[PDB]
Design an enzyme around this catalytic site. Structure first.
Site, PDB file in Angstrom:
ATOM      1  N   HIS A 165       0.754  -1.251  -0.134  1.00 24.71           N
ATOM      2  CA  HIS A 165       0.127  -0.018  -0.271  1.00 24.71           C
ATOM      3  C   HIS A 165       0.733   1.233  -0.103  1.00 24.71           C
ATOM      4  O   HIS A 165       0.307   2.366  -0.520  1.00 24.71           O
ATOM      5  CB  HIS A 165      -0.987   0.085   1.100  1.00 24.71           C
ATOM      6  CG  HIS A 165      -2.406   0.684   0.812  1.00 24.71           C
ATOM      7  ND1 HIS A 165      -2.449   1.958   0.377  1.00 24.71           N
ATOM      8  CD2 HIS A 165      -3.517   0.290   0.868  1.00 24.71           C
ATOM      9  CE1 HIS A 165      -3.733   2.139   0.019  1.00 24.71           C
ATOM     10  NE2 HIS A 165      -4.510   1.298   0.495  1.00 24.71           N
ATOM     11  N   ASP A 382      -8.566  -4.381 -19.511  1.00 25.94           N
ATOM     12  CA  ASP A 382      -8.852  -5.156 -20.841  1.00 25.94           C
ATOM     13  C   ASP A 382      -7.278  -5.241 -21.421  1.00 25.94           C
ATOM     14  O   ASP A 382      -6.827  -4.498 -22.039  1.00 25.94           O
ATOM     15  CB  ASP A 382      -9.703  -4.433 -21.885  1.00 25.94           C
ATOM     16  CG  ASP A 382      -9.897  -5.367 -23.150  1.00 25.94           C
ATOM     17  OD1 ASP A 382      -9.240  -6.322 -23.335  1.00 25.94           O
ATOM     18  OD2 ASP A 382     -10.922  -5.240 -23.856  1.00 25.94           O
TER      19      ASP A 382
HETATM   20  C1  LIG Z   1     -15.762   7.639  -0.543  1.00 32.51           C
HETATM   21  C2  LIG Z   1     -16.361   9.061  -0.860  1.00 32.51           C
HETATM   22  C3  LIG Z   1     -16.529   9.880   0.510  1.00 32.51           C
HETATM   23  C4  LIG Z   1     -17.802   8.506  -1.311  1.00 32.51           C
HETATM   24  O1  LIG Z   1     -17.968   8.405  -2.620  1.00 32.51           O
HETATM   25  P1  LIG Z   1     -18.089   6.917  -3.501  1.00 32.51           P
HETATM   26  O2  LIG Z   1     -18.923   5.730  -3.118  1.00 32.51           O
HETATM   27  O3  LIG Z   1     -16.619   6.694  -4.019  1.00 32.51           O
HETATM   28  O4  LIG Z   1     -18.787   7.783  -4.755  1.00 32.51           O
HETATM   29  P2  LIG Z   1     -18.844   9.348  -5.288  1.00 32.51           P
HETATM   30  O5  LIG Z   1     -19.813   9.936  -4.207  1.00 32.51           O
HETATM   31  O6  LIG Z   1     -17.620   9.971  -5.370  1.00 32.51           O
HETATM   32  O7  LIG Z   1     -19.485   9.369  -6.564  1.00 32.51           O
HETATM   33  C5  LIG Z   1     -21.012   8.785  -6.795  1.00 32.51           C
HETATM   34  C6  LIG Z   1     -21.989  10.093  -7.318  1.00 32.51           C
HETATM   35  O8  LIG Z   1     -21.302  10.699  -8.174  1.00 32.51           O
HETATM   36  C7  LIG Z   1     -22.193  10.367  -9.314  1.00 32.51           C
HETATM   37  N1  LIG Z   1     -21.465  10.262 -10.447  1.00 32.51           N
HETATM   38  C8  LIG Z   1     -20.847   9.137 -10.305  1.00 32.51           C
HETATM   39  N2  LIG Z   1     -20.042   8.819 -11.550  1.00 32.51           N
HETATM   40  C9  LIG Z   1     -20.303   9.981 -12.149  1.00 32.51           C
HETATM   41  C10 LIG Z   1     -19.827  10.335 -13.488  1.00 32.51           C
HETATM   42  N3  LIG Z   1     -19.122   9.617 -14.294  1.00 32.51           N
HETATM   43  N4  LIG Z   1     -20.235  11.484 -14.171  1.00 32.51           N
HETATM   44  C11 LIG Z   1     -20.906  12.277 -13.483  1.00 32.51           C
HETATM   45  N5  LIG Z   1     -21.827  11.874 -12.072  1.00 32.51           N
HETATM   46  C12 LIG Z   1     -21.166  10.862 -11.701  1.00 32.51           C
HETATM   47  C13 LIG Z   1     -23.385   9.358  -8.888  1.00 32.51           C
HETATM   48  O9  LIG Z   1     -24.628   9.587  -9.581  1.00 32.51           O
HETATM   49  C14 LIG Z   1     -23.197   9.544  -7.797  1.00 32.51           C
HETATM   50  O10 LIG Z   1     -24.181  10.778  -7.270  1.00 32.51           O
HETATM   51  P3  LIG Z   1     -25.106  10.292  -5.818  1.00 32.51           P
HETATM   52  O11 LIG Z   1     -26.054   9.065  -6.117  1.00 32.51           O
HETATM   53  O12 LIG Z   1     -26.043  11.576  -5.830  1.00 32.51           O
HETATM   54  O13 LIG Z   1     -24.331   9.922  -4.744  1.00 32.51           O
HETATM   55  C15 LIG Z   1     -15.746   9.886  -2.033  1.00 32.51           C
HETATM   56  O14 LIG Z   1     -15.800  11.214  -1.574  1.00 32.51           O
HETATM   57  C16 LIG Z   1     -14.466   9.511  -2.391  1.00 32.51           C
HETATM   58  O15 LIG Z   1     -13.596   9.944  -1.911  1.00 32.51           O
HETATM   59  N6  LIG Z   1     -14.154   8.356  -3.079  1.00 32.51           N
HETATM   60  C17 LIG Z   1     -12.984   7.798  -3.371  1.00 32.51           C
HETATM   61  C18 LIG Z   1     -12.510   7.085  -2.109  1.00 32.51           C
HETATM   62  C19 LIG Z   1     -11.339   6.170  -2.607  1.00 32.51           C
HETATM   63  O16 LIG Z   1     -10.162   6.549  -3.013  1.00 32.51           O
HETATM   64  N7  LIG Z   1     -11.296   4.747  -2.299  1.00 32.51           N
HETATM   65  C20 LIG Z   1     -10.040   3.843  -2.394  1.00 32.51           C
HETATM   66  C21 LIG Z   1      -9.236   3.958  -1.218  1.00 32.51           C
HETATM   67  S1  LIG Z   1      -7.628   3.079  -1.555  1.00 32.51           S
HETATM   68  C22 LIG Z   1      -8.005   1.321  -2.111  1.00 32.51           C
HETATM   69  O17 LIG Z   1      -8.993   0.815  -1.482  1.00 32.51           O
HETATM   70  C23 LIG Z   1      -7.100   0.714  -3.150  1.00 32.51           C
HETATM   71  C24 LIG Z   1      -7.744  -0.426  -3.784  1.00 32.51           C
HETATM   72  C25 LIG Z   1      -6.874  -1.046  -4.758  1.00 32.51           C
HETATM   73  C26 LIG Z   1      -7.362  -1.596  -5.762  1.00 32.51           C
HETATM   74  C27 LIG Z   1      -6.590  -1.935  -6.818  1.00 32.51           C
HETATM   75  C28 LIG Z   1      -5.230  -1.977  -6.760  1.00 32.51           C
HETATM   76  O18 LIG Z   1      -4.455  -2.557  -7.792  1.00 32.51           O
HETATM   77  C29 LIG Z   1      -4.602  -1.302  -5.919  1.00 32.51           C
HETATM   78  C30 LIG Z   1      -4.985  -0.685  -4.626  1.00 32.51           C
END
Ligand SMILES: CC(C)(COP(=O)(O)OP(=O)(O)OC[C@H]1O[C@@H](n2cnc3c(N)ncnc32)[C@H](O)[C@@H]1OP(=O)(O)O)[C@@H](O)C(=O)NCCC(=O)NCCSC(=O)/C=C/c1ccc(O)cc1
Length: 435
Positions: A165, A382
């Site tokens: 990581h 892919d």
């Molecule tokens: C976690 C949060 C707080 C929650 O969000 P989320 O579940 O990720 O979803 P989002 O809120 O960012 O996006 C969803 C929303 O955005 C919208 N949206 C959605 N895609 C679109 C779109 N392409 N166009 C335009 N609107 C959209 C979608 O409609 C939806 O709207 P809504 O229903 O109103 O909430 C978010 O702010 C955030 O930071 N997410 C990223 C977290 C993150 O970095 N996780 C990884 C941590 S590190 C890890 O685990 C590593 C794994 C790993 C894996 C493989 C490896 O080889 C190595 C490592």
């Protein structure tokens, strides 16, 4: 069951050209992510929807030599991936970019099929598809990246990835894997990585301006075998779940993450039988790239994980998803530029960051971690023989740790992969649909 899986060859793969020999400084966020090789597994089916063989025109289907050649090319721009961990004079972990290479191996499962894995729950049997790393006291001794390509009776393939990581978070890790895939497919990848991590250095002098609750010790129980499972919620279920929360004019809208997370937190808390006055803390990985201003270079290669940690009495969380979702969204909403900047400074002031590392003691009962992969490009790998039909965590090493996975198809469903105590899982299984 215990699947027959025979490893037919292991090989260290090196960058195919000159790479810089250097020590690569790690930022505070690089040092506080979990200390494991982050496990992921990809499945690819040999036949498509309508039954056509997905082998290429030359008869290849995940040809090892080809994948290794592409890997070697990928490791030139992404050279820290071919490095090793080390420590600087002060004892701070860094990456020794010494082109020590990555482990690539192939395996055969002659009696098992992709279908045998069912829902692809991240069990210890699924973890067998990733090479195992032996951790000693010498942190420089193991590769930062291990890969296994396993072939099945049905013609299908699994690719199991383990990525230490410190080198990369989700976005940067998948940037590597997808770039490797692009090269293998025979296309140049779009975005060259940006390697230097000094952009995430703290301010001088450090000036934190928040307590940073996310780096304080998690609550203990007020004075066991861990099950693993995966649960799908359809688009219609998620809709109905959201529709239960009052959405009034003039009240900012809850994110789907906050609603789902409240639901999971509520279900786990009930299944664990937490008293109303038991504090509980939910750990939410948050991507800093979307929050830091100015934004980082597009290809920034590293961890940019900050952490939102809603924290409440179990009574608040279990009273309902509405109340829990509000607490989570508030914690998310804190995670802006100024907060993430403060966090860098805070981490800089710590004498030993290994103490802040998120691990088993972080996520275990009464607490929880819920890492969203919903916006990670997990289905874009892919290599030339099609997109995967599933991608998920290879295993879940810590009780209380969970993942939100997007669907591999267009149905808008989400899945929650989770680890809980076995006695608790039996209830969780029922509760997650009991609304
Ligand atoms: C976690 C949060 C707080 C929650 O969000 P989320 O579940 O990720 O979803 P989002 O809120 O960012 O996006 C969803 C929303 O955005 C919208 N949206 C959605 N895609 C679109 C779109 N392409 N166009 C335009 N609107 C959209 C979608 O409609 C939806 O709207 P809504 O229903 O109103 O909430 C978010 O702010 C955030 O930071 N997410 C990223 C977290 C993150 O970095 N996780 C990884 C941590 S590190 C890890 O685990 C590593 C794994 C790993 C894996 C493989 C490896 O080889 C190595 C490592």
């Amino acid at each position: 069951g215990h699947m027959k899986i025979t490893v037919r060859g292991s090989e260290m793969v090196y960058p195919a050209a000159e790479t810089p020999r250097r020590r690569l400084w790690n930022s505070g966020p690089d040092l506080v992510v979990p200390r494991f090789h982050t496990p992921s597994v990809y499945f690819f089916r040999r036949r498509d929807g309508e039954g056509n063989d997905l082998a290429a025109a030359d008869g290849s289907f995940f040809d090892g030599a080809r994948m290794r050649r592409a890997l070697a090319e990928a490791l030139v721009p992404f050279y820290p991936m071919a490095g090793r961990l080390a420590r600087d004079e002060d004892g701070r972990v860094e990456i020794d970019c010494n082109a020590g290479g990555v482990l690539f191996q192939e395996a055969d499962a002659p009696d098992a099929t992709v279908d045998d894995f069912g829902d692809f729950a991240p069990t210890m049997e699924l973890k067998r598809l990733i090479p195992t790393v032996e951790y000693t006291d010498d942190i420089s001794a193991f590769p930062l990246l291990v890969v296994q390509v396993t072939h099945f009776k049905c013609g299908g393939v699994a690719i199991g990835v383990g990525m230490q990581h410190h080198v990369a978070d989700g976005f940067s890790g998948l940037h590597f894997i997808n770039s490797w895939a692009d090269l293998c497919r025979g296309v140049p990848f779009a975005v060259m990585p940006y390697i230097d991590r000094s952009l995430l250095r703290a301010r001088d002098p450090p000036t934190p301006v928040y307590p940073h609750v996310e780096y304080q010790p998690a609550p203990a129980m007020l004075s066991p075998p861990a099950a693993v499972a995966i649960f799908r919620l359809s688009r219609a279920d998620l809709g109905r779940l959201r529709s239960q929360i009052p959405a009034r004019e003039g009240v900012p809208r809850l994110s789907t993450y906050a609603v789902l997370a409240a639901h999971v937190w509520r279900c786990a808390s009930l299944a664990r039988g937490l008293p109303a006055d038991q504090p509980t803390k939910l750990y939410c990985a948050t991507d800093g790239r979307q929050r830091l201003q100015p934004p980082l270079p597009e290809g920034y290669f590293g961890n940019v994980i900050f952490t939102a940690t809603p924290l409440a009495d179990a009574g608040t969380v279990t009273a309902g998803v509405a109340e829990g979702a509000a607490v989570i969204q508030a914690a998310l909403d804190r995670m802006d530029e100024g907060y993430c900047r403060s966090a860098l400074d805070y981490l800089e002031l710590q004498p030993d960051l290994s103490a802040l590392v998120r691990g088993a003691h972080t996520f275990r009962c009464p607490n929880l971690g819920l890492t969203s992969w919903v916006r990670l490009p997990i289905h874009d790998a892919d290599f030339g023989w099609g997109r995967p039909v599933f991608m998920g965590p290879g295993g879940i090493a810590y009780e209380g740790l969970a993942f939100v996975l997007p669907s591999a198809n267009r149905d808008g469903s989400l899945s929650v992969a989770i680890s809980l105590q076995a006695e608790h899982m039996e209830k969780f299984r029922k509760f997650i649909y009991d609304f």
